[PDB]
């Protein structure tokens, strides 16, 4: 197939124009993955005076500010009974008009609502990369794309307009489900549409248009604080992104796969007559396509079953889960630092780009274990540091937290490259997959944990440290991948 994507044009006028529209929609990932920390925002809350009859009304914490989750039962002027808040909070709304926090008083006992509804976006994510996994491989990479596009938009849109906490999740589910879907579909679409040798190359747009999209969350969440109008927003293009995809031409590579080489010609040719190489299009018939791809024409239980697999599994699992649960933590709690949410959503963002070339440096000029070791190690450390110093030093702990979230993305690349150097031919994709499946998992325990802030304030973040502190020295199992050819069989992991 490579020859003949070759024969049909070099990466010209055709893969330029479906790439850039392909991965136009994952600028917005970041901006649903990390929606919440903006649309679910946490105002200061204090109660609500009776309205019968604040110094009287609140009691004071030792900041001496008013408590959010209590009320006097009497009026005490100048040890006072405090009754828990019936008639409702009363929300500071200079930095947040309105928040899914404000609207459905997700405060005081009902705090862990916030983050289950975190929990169950990615739950959605998580099962939305199986289902639409099956269903891309058996209606096609592209009307999989068109129906996820359209699933995001009215799950989004549904969203913003949810009359309920429950309705409100339902869609969140629903809207990752489907983004899960475009986040896989645009890879395989673009990669199997795209030469071999400029593979690398499309997998490396994929990751920084999605570190652009951080700084569109922070621009677009500036300019639209109000949560439903905020959701509707970054859910709107996707209904544009639903209605030019019905112009995508489906992957050739699926349709051969399928035994239907009448629309691998026909798309081939397509191309051709776009590429603008129309007389070598005309050349391509089946009599040529039968021939040469003809060559071209595991399970995960192997995956577990052989012991020298399931090693290489396991300690990758690890190392996929820790990355994610610790950066998923890390990136879900901007409020704390005593910065703006805005300013630090965009610092975060533009760490990814130094970071990303700093581990691209470290991963090829020394080894890919050292760079896994050290990318999860500091950044445990980090994370476990900003756990201990004192919130008064705001810079001490945003530059930690900032340190921390660039290796978490360096580990993010580094594990991607390290993973299919160390699998072989056979299993590689199961591998990659079931991977990525264990940072699904990740995300989903990451806001799960972050429920624990209530048993001790920093139970959360010494969790978030620990957690890659141990998965650095599962590294030390895996073995180095620089400079060795990958391998074809079990036996050569084996050798290895
Ligand atoms: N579901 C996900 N699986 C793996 N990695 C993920 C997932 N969602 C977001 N990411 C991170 C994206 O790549 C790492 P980057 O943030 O440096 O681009």
Same mark, same amino acid.
């Given at each position: 197939?490579?020859?003949?994507?070759?024969?049909?044009?070099?990466?010209?006028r055709?893969?330029?124009?479906?790439?850039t529209?392909?991965?136009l929609?994952?600028?917005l990932?970041?901006?649903?993955?990390?929606l919440?920390?903006?649309?679910?925002?946490? =105002?200061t809350?204090?109660?609500?005076?009776?309205?019968?009859?604040?110094?009287?009304?609140? =009691?004071?914490?030792?900041?001496?500010?008013?408590?959010?989750?209590? #009320?006097?039962?009497?009026?005490?002027?100048?040890?006072?009974?405090?009754?828990?808040?019936?008639?409702?909070?009363?929300?500071?709304?200079?930095?947040?008009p309105?928040?899914?926090?404000?609207?459905?008083?997700?405060?005081?006992?009902? #705090?862990?609502?916030?983050?289950?509804?975190?929990?169950?976006?990615?739950v959605?994510?998580?099962?939305?990369?199986?289902?639409?996994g099956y269903?891309?491989?058996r209606?096609?990479? #592209?009307?999989?794309?068109?129906?996820?596009?359209?699933?995001?938009?009215?799950?989004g849109?549904?969203?913003?307009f949810?009359?309920?906490?429950?309705?409100?999740?339902?869609?969140?589910?629903?809207?990752?489900?489907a983004?899960?879907?475009?986040s896989?579909?645009?890879?395989?679409?673009?990669?199997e549409?795209?030469?071999?040798?400029?593979?690398?190359?499309?997998g490396?747009?994929?990751?920084?248009?999605?570190?652009?999209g951080?700084f569109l969350?922070?621009?677009?969440?500036?300019?639209?604080?109000?949560?439903?109008?905020?959701?509707?927003?970054?859910?709107?293009?996707?209904f544009?992104?639903?209605? /030019?995809?019905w112009?995508?031409?489906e992957?050739?590579?699926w349709h051969?796969?399928?035994?239907?080489?009448?629309?691998?010609?026909?798309?081939?040719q397509?191309?051709?007559?776009?590429?603008?190489?129309?007389?070598?299009?005309?050349?391509?018939?089946?009599?040529?396509?039968?021939?040469?791809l003809?060559?071209?024409?595991?399970?995960?239980?192997?995956?577990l079953?052989?012991?020298?697999?399931?090693?290489?599994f396991?300690?990758?699992?690890?190392?996929?889960?820790?990355?994610?649960?610790? /950066?998923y933590?890390?990136?879900?709690?901007?409020?704390?630092?005593?910065?703006?949410?805005?300013?630090?959503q965009?610092?975060?963002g533009?760490?990814?780009?130094?970071?990303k070339?700093?581990?691209?440096?470290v991963?090829?000029?020394?080894?890919?274990? =050292?760079?896994?070791?050290?990318?999860?190690?500091?950044?445990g450390?980090?994370?476990?540091?900003?756990?201990?110093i004192?919130?008064?030093?705001?810079?001490?702990?945003?530059?930690?937290?900032?340190?921390?979230?660039?290796c978490?993305?360096?580990?993010?690349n580094?594990?991607?490259?390290?993973t299919?150097?160390?699998?072989?031919?056979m299993? #590689?994709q199961?591998g990659?997959?079931?991977?990525?499946?264990?940072?699904?998992?990740?995300?989903?325990?990451?806001?799960?944990?972050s429920?624990?802030?209530?048993?001790?304030?920093?139970?959360?973040?010494?969790?978030?440290?620990?957690?890659?502190?141990?998965?650095?020295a599962?590294?030390?199992?895996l073995?180095?991948?620089?400079g060795? =050819?990958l391998?074809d069989?079990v036996q050569?992991?084996?050798?290895?």
């Open positions: 197939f490579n020859d003949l994507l070759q024969q049909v044009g070099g990466v010209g055709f893969q330029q124009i479906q790439v529209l392909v991965v929609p994952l600028l990932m970041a901006s649903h993955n990390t919440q920390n903006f649309t679910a925002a946490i =105002p809350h204090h109660c609500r005076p009776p309205a019968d009859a604040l110094e009287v009304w609140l =009691p004071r914490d030792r900041q001496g500010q008013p408590e959010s989750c209590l #009320r006097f039962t009497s009026p005490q002027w100048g040890t006072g009974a405090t009754e828990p808040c019936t008639d409702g909070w009363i929300y500071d709304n200079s930095t947040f309105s928040t899914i926090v404000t609207e459905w008083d997700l405060v005081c006992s009902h #705090r862990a609502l916030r983050q289950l509804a975190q929990s169950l976006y990615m959605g994510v998580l099962l939305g990369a199986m289902v639409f269903l891309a491989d209606l096609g990479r #592209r009307k999989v794309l068109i129906l996820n596009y359209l699933q995001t938009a009215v799950s849109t549904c969203a913003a949810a009359p309920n906490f429950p309705i409100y999740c339902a869609f969140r589910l629903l809207s990752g489900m983004l899960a879907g475009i896989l579909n645009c890879m395989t679409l673009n990669v549409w795209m030469p071999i040798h400029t593979r690398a190359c499309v490396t747009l994929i990751g920084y248009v999605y570190s652009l951080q969350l922070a621009g677009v969440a500036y300019a639209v604080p109000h949560w439903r109008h905020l959701q509707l927003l970054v859910s709107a293009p996707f544009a992104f639903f209605i /030019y995809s112009f995508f031409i992957s050739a590579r051969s796969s399928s035994g239907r080489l009448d629309l691998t010609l026909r798309a081939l397509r191309v051709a007559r776009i590429n603008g190489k129309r007389e070598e299009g005309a050349k391509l018939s089946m009599e040529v396509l039968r021939a040469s003809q060559k071209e024409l595991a399970s995960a239980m192997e995956l079953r052989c012991p020298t697999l399931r090693h290489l396991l300690c990758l699992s690890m190392l996929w889960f820790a990355t994610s649960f610790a /950066y933590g890390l990136v879900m709690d901007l409020q704390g630092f005593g910065v703006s949410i805005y300013l630090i965009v610092i975060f533009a760490v990814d780009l130094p970071a070339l700093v581990g691209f440096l991963i090829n000029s020394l080894g890919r274990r =050292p760079a896994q070791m050290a990318a999860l190690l500091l950044a450390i980090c994370i476990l540091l900003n756990g201990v004192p919130q008064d030093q705001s810079i001490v702990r945003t530059s930690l937290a900032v340190l921390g979230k660039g978490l993305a360096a580990s993010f580094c594990i991607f490259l390290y299919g150097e160390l699998y072989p031919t299993i #590689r199961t990659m997959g079931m991977g990525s499946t264990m940072a699904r998992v990740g995300s989903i325990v990451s806001p799960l944990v429920m624990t802030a209530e048993l001790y304030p920093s139970m959360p973040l010494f969790i978030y440290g620990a957690v890659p502190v141990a998965a650095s599962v590294t030390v199992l073995p180095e991948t620089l060795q =050819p391998p069989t050569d992991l084996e050798s290895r």
